[PDB]
Design a protein around this ligand. Structure first.
Ligand code: 4VG
Length: 330
């Protein structure tokens, strides 16, 4: 037989996983769907090739430990991990996850969402985020392609590769210098569900700022009273005045409760931005909000080691150890 190959990438995941097809990619790897001949369903297999770069090694170890600890309906998990039987041979890691049918990015390219569906998707994003944040974890890269959907509108957040204890979805703080950065991203996603287009599609860093200011209007002095990059501050002060554009002009036929929540998520000042529990409790989400049925994590997630300080080789060792429990005869 042999090991299978997909678009230039070896996928050494047989014999349990076969019939592979491309379904996505990342900076240092690729995702395929595959047939699992044990559970008799198709799965997703995420191949990661990180070991040349320390940063990639850090993220890979964070992603694995986070996801193996988390357990939540609106969060992608890990069912299996494949890697070589010896550390000298381990060049790749294969993370096996539940297969989802599509993502919100694709959905928004092809479909108009009803207000009820927007409401329901927003609720599930926030319910999952509430769990994440309750563990004192930040996702940091929420965007429509990281929101997976199955046939029945169940939603799951994926790609925890940037999790810690994308320009269009990037909060102003990030560019002008916390859980509030995920809230900003969710705001951008809500706006995108409302109009089927990204609200702040900047082509570069400066242009991103101009797009935000183009809607929010010139920042107040309180908005600028904070630690801020000098270049950014000087740049913003060099700009002419910008008027605030009212949400109901940008989104003429949107539910007014949806816009009220949007306004609170897309607040320039992170300290004034709505937090996830308040967002779930907002009137827009009344029909789904159910604090009886919104799990939080038992304890805040913490790492025992300073991953930032460790050399690649030590991290690779840790990855080898973390993944050992999935090896046969363990
Ligand atoms: O982590 C995922 C991922 C995994 C999945 C996933 C998981 C389960 N099912 C389905 N179904 C598909 C069916 C067709 O339509 C789209 C959804 N997708 C999606 N993503 C999002 C994009 C790919 N990356 C990340 C980058 O962000 C990544 C991957 C590999 C290496 C590296 Cl370095 C990073």
């Amino acid at each position: 037989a042999g090991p299978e190959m997909v678009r230039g990438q070896v996928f050494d995941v047989g014999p349990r996983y076969t019939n592979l097809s491309y379904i996505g990619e990342g900076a240092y790897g690729m995702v395929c769907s595959a047939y699992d001949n044990v559970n008799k369903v198709r799965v997703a297999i995420k191949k990661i090739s990180p070991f040349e770069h320390q940063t990639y090694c850090q993220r890979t170890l964070r992603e694995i430990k986070i996801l193996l600890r988390f357990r939540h309906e609106n969060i992608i998990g890990i069912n299996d991990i494949i890697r070589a039987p010896t550390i000298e041979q381990m060049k790749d890691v294969y993370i096996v996850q539940d297969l989802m049918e599509t993502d919100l990015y694709k959905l928004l390219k092809t479909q108009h969402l009803s207000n009820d569906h927007i409401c329901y998707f927003l609720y599930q994003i926030l319910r999952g985020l509430k769990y994440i944040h309750s563990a004192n974890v930040l996702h940091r890269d929420l965007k429509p392609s990281n929101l997976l959907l199955n046939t029945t509108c169940d939603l799951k957040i994926c790609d925890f590769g940037l999790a810690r204890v994308t320009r269009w979805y990037r909060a102003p703080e990030i560019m002008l210098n916390t859980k509030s950065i995920d809230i900003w991203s969710v705001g951008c996603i809500l706006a995108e569900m409302l109009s089927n287009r990204p609200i702040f599609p900047g082509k570069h860093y400066l242009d991103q700022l101009n797009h935000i200011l183009g809607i929010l209007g010139s920042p107040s002095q309180e908005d600028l009273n904070c630690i801020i990059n000098l270049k950014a501050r000087n740049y913003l002060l060099s700009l002419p005045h910008k008027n605030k554009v009212p949400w109901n002009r940008l989104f003429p036929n949107a539910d007014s409760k949806a816009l009220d929540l949007l306004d609170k998520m897309l607040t320039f000042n992170p300290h004034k931005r709505i937090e996830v529990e308040q967002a779930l409790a907002h009137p827009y989400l009344e029909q789904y909000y159910d604090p009886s049925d919104e799990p939080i994590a038992e304890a805040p997630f913490k790492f025992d080691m300073e991953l930032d300080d460790l050399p690649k080789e030590k991290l690779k060792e840790l990855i080898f150890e973390e993944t050992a429990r999935f090896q046969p005869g363990y």
